[model samples]
Target chain A: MALLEICCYSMECALTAQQNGADRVELCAAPKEGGLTPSLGVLKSVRQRVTIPVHPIIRPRGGDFCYSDGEFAAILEDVRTVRELGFPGLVTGVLDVDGNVDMPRMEKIMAAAGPLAVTFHRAFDMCANPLYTLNNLAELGIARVLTSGQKSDALQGLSKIMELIAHRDAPIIMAGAGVRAENLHHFLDAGVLEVHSSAGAWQASPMRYRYSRYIVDGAAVAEMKGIIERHQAK
Target chain B: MALLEICCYSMECALTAQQNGADRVELCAAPKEGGLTPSLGVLKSVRQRVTIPVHPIIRPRGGDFCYSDGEFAAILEDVRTVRELGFPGLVTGVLDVDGNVDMPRMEKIMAAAGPLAVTFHRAFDMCANPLYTLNNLAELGIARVLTSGQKSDALQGLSKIMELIAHRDAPIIMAGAGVRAENLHHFLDAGVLEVHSSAGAWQASPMRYRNEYSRYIVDGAAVAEMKGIIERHQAKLE
Candidate 1:
């Protein structure tokens, strides 16, 4: 069976995702930026709150999927630091300017992670091609790929997602931009095993600035629960 | 002249706004909700960095501007706690159910903030009618009205903004959504003396969550652009 993962930003969503039967929680600070690694305090607090394995995203900031030398170093330092802090899984990915996997750097990260499950994050979708990228990830021995079918919405990317799932040795995990319960069943009915969701409800992060009006994110819990319940029934 | 302000989420932008010639800074946590009060650490750290008054936005969470009683209390408590920490001003406002000024509550805030200057923020625009709300604010004795003519983009509301400026007895400080460096000349040409801005260049905050594409606030170039606007406008401050 593929994993049923719920990505979450706040303590509230983490609790809610667990209560609603999420298989794992991808812990991050803001879903608005494609998700970044959370603080040490949040990591410890969330670890205590749920039984699910919490995978902290390792990006330093949100912009393009590529990283600078400094940022890549920061992501490495984050993995080492979080591993020391006892997180069980680490979610991350890195790509070169040409849109191929940056293998040398990724091998270094996999070595640093040592025995922890490493799920290549959504940088998969940003690649020039999905089929080629899936082969590359599978060759690297990555456990899963969180993607939205190389389109803005996962439902829109279903054919490509199903094709990748069919063509790959490793499981191609469909996530990012879209993945709800109704579609989860559709993906499952199409033979998809694992799904990824943030299950976030729109709540404003506590900041009042020029950009505050646009800061609140949609959590979409009802959509998540519906997906979960329907998935269980099947 | 009314105070030129800086409302920012990142420490870098706060420091940069101070360096690039800002009169004040409003420290807040997430600009994605139009803003809410920042963390205690942000206030303390920014204070350590600059001598300018750093006022905190007293919102509990970003949603609709209307507050429940508990949320209202939280805002008041945040204001008191943050003010006691030594900020010199606050940017805030409230609307009655009828979409006019919450005069009684405004008075309570005024009383609570005896010496501190209060600039009624853009919650003024959400009112049912902006012109009526402007008069209501003037009558309520607000020190300034931060408005962008109640339009989605302040530039779009210029004509009404000009009319309000001409009509109002109280100082109507023009602000909210479209008071950038490129258009400083426009606002100045319109004869707006008092202005507001955030050192909110398109920089990223240290705080992170689940998605990278979803986390970005604005582009960094926007801040440099606003600073340029302010510098050119500062020459006209006389």
Candidate 2:
């Protein structure tokens, strides 16, 4: 039975994920931008209400995992803010042009994170080698990793997911992207202990004008949680 | 006789495009993010230096064209700045959840732009029906449109672009993306009046320890010589 960590883009979605029995919530903003760093307003709001473990992604921009120095400076400051906001964990990643994890920047980020648990985000999926990347992540003693096994989604990367999970001292490999309740059993049956999903859908925003954007689906989260419950019960 | 509009990520690139005899420069930042709104700092600096018509893109972020109230709010703020900066032209676009032009938000964007000319950005390519979207944009009296003919690149999307251009009172359809000196005639011969390109190449920053995730800057030599190449080719043909 894998724990379900649902990726959320707003305070309301985080609460919904928690109410629906998700193990944790990977908080973020700009879901369409592939998960950008949420503003302090959002971070504070979500942290106050949501009781589950919340890990906000700290991406400054949306295009690539590799960042320039200016971008890295912004990230470094955001990490300091994450610690100040009293977050239990944070999600972020950095890579060199060639796709290797940049140890220099990663070390500074980890140091800035202080006691906050760090989970390398999908930048791992863009890495040159999964095994070598896994070893590097393990060396840092990262709390967990949210990935799709370097494939489009968890199922497609099932073998890779299994392969990474087999490595000793490896961080918790939480399969993510395109994970749904209907296919939740695939990961559960494969000895996977954790999974991540957005379970997102387009919904109209509550404004005078209809401004529709992608938000989390509570029903989908509940269904995935129910599947996990059944697996755990067995 | 196609007008060249090189998409620029920095002021230096804009200068390169202008010095090269390119007709215009679509100034923007974060080229990797598909041309986002340039920071006011870059905006002010570029406007002061580049004498040519510089149309800076006003995209708030990278990703889908559909935006929420918050994102729309941000775009509005950026539009006001474009007008304030004394720019002659600006590039931007908006779309609805159903993949149609966001007429409501666009009306507000054009109003914010005031007298400044606005070209519908790549957001047009993401629409559900090109013809239907084209009709909607024409209603707004937009200045121009930068598109890839609704394909990943202009060549593949050529037929679609031609179809849109064929529409009555269709906005000037400027072919962009993967356009080069070699294929310049394809657009010129196709009756396309304008073209956009980054003519981009990756280069290291001033920092000695550059990350392998290097940045893609404007290629000065290739882009500068492009107008010369096109002019010479046209001269020979004529």
Candidate 3:
């Protein structure tokens, strides 16, 4: 069965996702930076609360996918850690200066991951060429591909995503970024199998005024959940 | 021996801290919000790497010490996970409306911690009174207290910190915030035995343009310099 996944930035969202019947959750720390590896405490606490699988996004930061040696080493260790924590999978990837997959490092991470499946994150979007990157990831044994169709929003790149899905061999094409209930049918119509949403909003808490700007929005999560469930019915 | 500590916001800093001789690390996420408890993967990985203690901060969000039932439940589970991960200590606290320690909750956490040492974090500073809060922590049997004498910066509240130190029967007062080489001696002269520093300017990596909007980065050098200053101060005292 095709699974509906929500990417959670906190334990609150993880519980919300589990309660809302999300099949899985992609755990990350800083969603504003487009997701990064969450802390060990965050991962384990979320794991203990729900029966669903928690796959952590392993981006060191929310910047470009190109990684320094130090960042790469850190990413390797992060992947190994999620695997050891017995996560079902990890979401990560590395790009080169030319915006292509860093094959050597990618291979190292995959090898280190052992049985833990690797989903080439939206770093797939930054590639110089989406088709070439997709093909490379396929050859590298990537389990899934998350993209916005190489457009700023997945809806804008719907045609390309359709084409990629049609042409790609086996790796799943998961449409993300700006995906909503109103337009999810557009993705399903394009033959995309999975959708990702945070479904939460950042509400202001004066207690953390120094860091209040970092809160996630709850409405976003609710709206996305509504869309996800609606789409799942089809 | 004085412990060289590192405050890690990421895996790289954790590793670097260990390599550079950081004896312990305060593990957390989003230091810009005063740090939240770290994820389970980080605690496990750091435990695998260095032999030192990795005491994770247990703030639910980057917010005030007041916790909703959900937030407190999350923290309770965090206490369990950190204990399960075999961490040597936990840095956490909770306060009531009057700024006194939440003794009942603190006791529950202490019980969950097993053998792990509990250090009431800077949330202690937010209390209504530093002396009252310090005594409450002592009653709860918390091992350490990270504070800046109820002021925003430690150097500014030196005298009050000393007073708290002299007044406390239990719980070591570890001065935090605005601690630098120039002021390390002043704090030492005032009798603070342990200190905390991120040591690095936590700016996001320039290469990762996407994370440019981040406030999570900490450059560890600032922490390293603080460690150096503490050592120098200790030598002079000796």
Candidate 4:
């Protein structure tokens, strides 16, 4: 059995996923920049429109998981707003300058996000000692971690992802990056129950003055959700 | 005594506004494009760094005050976030397609800004009718309006600014645009007790690999000077 999580870049995209049967969306902004934090406007607009369980990504910017104090503080502040807005959970991650789990900052982030579940995002891929850090995240009370098995592609790191899941009592291992219907079977077969995908493609916007960015492909989302739902029935 | 609300272009400028004796700051971003909404990064940055009252400007972009439904939705979202972050007040405004107060949208903005005082920004200048909107604003529970008397310069709008103050039950008129120490006297003389100024100047950034764009910095000396000027103006009145 498996679950589908869609990474949505706009309220329109998120709604399309929800209407077409997405279990949840990882809300983010900066579609071309690899998903920065959603602005206040987009967050509220999406929350107003979408009824599915939504978890906003609390990143201030893209690039690396390592952050400055100001950047770290911004993450904490955004977590407060996410909680205020009544999000059930949020996706974010942090690492030290040395590429290890940043316990102090993560502690503060978890503190601000109290009562809301936390997902340590792909930053886990950039950290050292995967199993050791997995233990650390579990100890820190994290609900889950999204990863590509510390590899560029989740399928390529299938064995590593398989190994990570063997450590029970660890945070839920949700495989992401390069996940799609054609290749999703490999993850489900590996007992990787929760999977994430952008499932997005860009099309010319209906707007006369359009930015023409990527939005969730409702057809693609339904395909993945259909496959996952079939798996869940078994 | 007149309260000084500095138009801060960045966190550095906002800190300068506080350090140099300004009473509060109207936080904004994209200095050269007029004051658009401050992003989450700087909003949190300035909130953590400055102790003074901070009222963020929530304009989604530059140009007309008439915003589409999506744009207006974004404004309300930003207001909720601002309230969540513990700001005491914020600056924003909206106009209908016909150049009047978009009452429906403004009511939503006020509702979103519940418990947080709101100052209608310069969008007031662009509205079709002044006195009519002024009463509309006060009745809507707006705390204040920042304007230049519908002119580019507060001094040039002297007659209009004086006329605005004569109407009772109007939101407090905070004169802005082209306000500075040297001519700050005229506004006080006209009984305009609140003022907003950028008090900013562009300087070359220190980054060796700097971009072609000029950097903006708050004029601390000007802020201090205005503080003293207002002090003297108010002391004499009492």
Candidate 5:
């Protein structure tokens, strides 16, 4: 059976994903810039509200994976805070200016993470060579790599995904990006065991004067869960 | 001299305000709903970036100031976190269903706030009686109150602001809302000691694919000009 992981941007969406039977959730803030570290208030609130596993993304900002010392310090502090709060896992990735993993910085973050499960995030997709990066992550003891098989989406990069799956030994190669109910079976057919998606829709704010137009729809979450369950049954 | 407190929604804005010589900043998230309690990540990052005082808003949600017990508890937790982090002050407000100040809950929040300065936010604008609510805040030891004098803008409420200034004893009567370089003299002329505004202008996001239409940012030049005007007015007073 394939595991379903929903990427949630707010506390409301996290609860929705859990209530609708998502196996886990990746909690983040500012989903538009890919994803950034969520506020501590959000992390604490969501942790209090849900029973499912929550993995928070630890990117400090939305641009390139390369970071300065100050930015990296902030990232480490966030990692320490997340670990201290006793979350089960954390999602993050760091790369050099040349587009390879920053092993030293990754080691520092992982040490701060301690025993908490770590998933190298989509920064993996930005690497110069996917196979080399995969081997490094495996040897580094990363628990998972949430990637699109080094392409725009899993469907387009199915060939590389198959190659990674064939070579998969230690770390799990979780398929993500543009993953939906219609195309989910393709990953399953290719022997992929887990998938990540937002499964989200737009919502309007109830305020008379609206500032932000970005609200997530949980109904899409339920529909996606149903599709994943039915496919697993098959 | 009267102080200029700029309300900022991001670390970048807070830094900009500090760099441009603004007295202090009121940090909040989701400014469209008036303002909401900022995330801890924001609190920490802004605190790290600026040397000036940063008073975070403790609002749990946007709409009304009245809150359920659960919501109030969340507000208290946020207060405790802010105080624990050693911020200089916090902004928040609590009102009853009757449009009166929620004293008991406010007491709890104030207790958690301890030495931290507390500014009763614009929830005062919704109070059934502004004068009565002002007195309550004074007796409760709140440091300041941010209001447009219970009207849409400070200029519109200038008369009421004068009334509040007349009776103001303990809490600083901080005039806000639509206060800019052009209209700042109105608050000072009315005897307001402090004023708040975003001093903000809309700017396009640098991202190629933008999610928000335009983010409200505090322009340093505007903040500096407002500060200069306030100081010049103070100079004239001296």
Candidate 6:
């Protein structure tokens, strides 16, 4: 059976994901800006609420994956915090300004992530070459790589994803990005074993004076889970 | 001399503030939202860059002082993380739905911040009564309370600030909000011993595509001048 990972933005959303049958969650903050490391408070709250393994994304900011020395140090500290909190895994990615995998910095982050499983995030899609990056990640013992095949959506990068799946053995290539109920089976049919999606929908704020515009929809998540479960049963 | 505490949003700002003679920094993220707790990355990097005391804010979000039980638990964990990282102090605040200090929750947080000094932030300004809250803080052994005198700026809250200072002896009342070199003396004249401000000015991002509208940074010159003003005032008094 294929595994379903929901990208969650809050404790409530994480709880909903678990209640509805998500195998795991990639917890993050500022999902509208493409996910940064969540606060220690959010991490602790989410970890306490959900029994499913929570892999917190470790990107320090929302922009490019290549980070300054200070930013990289911050990422390493976040990894240490996650480990100290007793989380089982974390997600992160680093690229050199030249558009290649940043092996030197990744080695330090990997060491900090010690014994905790690490998933290289979508920064893999921005790399100069996916095939080359895949080989390097496998050698680094990265447990997985969340990618959309270098395209904005998984369907558009279907061919490349299939090729990479066939190409790598050590690091699992989990298809993500714009993954919905409609196209999930296509990737599963293409030999992909893991999938990631927010299964999120816009929710209205109950407060009259709203600070946030939306939140994750559990109904949407359940719908996606139903699709994945039906496909796996087949 | 009156201590100049700079509220810094980034590592560079913290370094600049420390280099120019500020006594300490209140490290936070999302300064425009009035300072939420910063990521562990920012705290770790800022701590490494400066030798002076670094006190991080422990806010979970920006909107209000009231937090859910889960959110409060997160704040406690954040306090634990800061203690583990070896920082000297931290800033935080909490209010009940009734606009009073949440004493029970604050007790738990104080326990987590053991041995490290705790500064109750400006959430005091949003309280039902400053005098009542000030008394509670002192009794709680909070090291200090950062406030704007319950007004938009410290100058406007001047009388109220003086009253609070006169009212308390245990926790130091550190004046903050809209503090600048121009009016820092006003706070000093009011007998405030410590003051906090960003001393920050908007600087253009070196990045071509700027994600933020502006970055608030402490001008080194301004920091030096603020420090000089405080010292010169002290010298005159002596």
Q: Pick the candidate with the highest lDDT.
A: 6
Two-chain complex of model 6, DockQ on C-alpha atoms against the true structure: 0.26
Can you tell me the CAPRI class of model 6? acceptable
Worst 10 residues of 6 chain B by lDDT: B205-214
Given candidate 6, what's the lDDT at residue A161?
A: 92
User: Which pairs clash in the backbone of model 4?
Assistant: none
Docking band of candidate 4: incorrect
- lDDT of candidate 2 over A1-234, digit per residue (tens): 578899987677788889998889998765555777765545666667889999988875565676765456667877887788788999998887677888888999989999998999888888877889888887776888888888877799998898888886588888888889889999998888888999988776433322455677889999999889988797
Q: Which stretches of candidate 1 lie over 4 Å from their true place?
A: A7-15, A26-63, A67-96, A101-119, A129-144, A151-178, A189-191, A198-234, B1-3, B6-19, B22-63, B66-121, B127-174, B181-194, B198-238
RMSD of each: 8.3, 8.0, 4.2, 7.9, 5.2, 4.3
Report the lDDT of model 4 for residue B23: 95
Assess every candidate by TM-score. 0.55, 0.58, 0.80, 0.61, 0.73, 0.79
Interface RMSD of each: 9.8, 8.5, 4.9, 8.1, 6.7, 4.8
Better of 1 and 3 by TM-score: 3
Give the winner by DockQ: 1 or 6: 6
Better of 2 and 4 by DockQ: 4
* Residue range B105-173, candidate 3, lDDT tens digits: 888888898888898988788777667677777777788888888788988878878888899757988
lDDT string, candidate 4, B1-238, tens digits? 9999899866777888899999989987555447666657679888779999999988754556766565577888899889998999999998865678889888998898989989998878877788999999998898988988889888888788888888854689899989998899999888997899889876643322210224566899999999999999899987
| Fnat across every predicted model, in order | 0.04, 0.00, 0.16, 0.18, 0.07, 0.34
lDDT of 6 by residue, A17-38 (tens): 8998888899876555566677
Model 5 in CAPRI terms: which quality?
Answer: incorrect
Candidate 5 lDDT over B89-117, as tens digits, reads: 99999887678898999999899999999
> lDDT value for candidate 6?
0.83
Error of 4 at B148 (Å): 22
**Tens-digit lDDT track of model 3 for A31-97:** 5556667766566666677577878888755556666665576677778878887898889988776
Angstrom error of the Cα, residue B199, model 4: value is 16
Q: Candidate 4 chain B: minimum summed lDDT over ten consecutive residues — where?
A: B205-214
Candidate 6, residue A187: how far the Cα is off, in Å: 6.1
Best by TM-score: 3
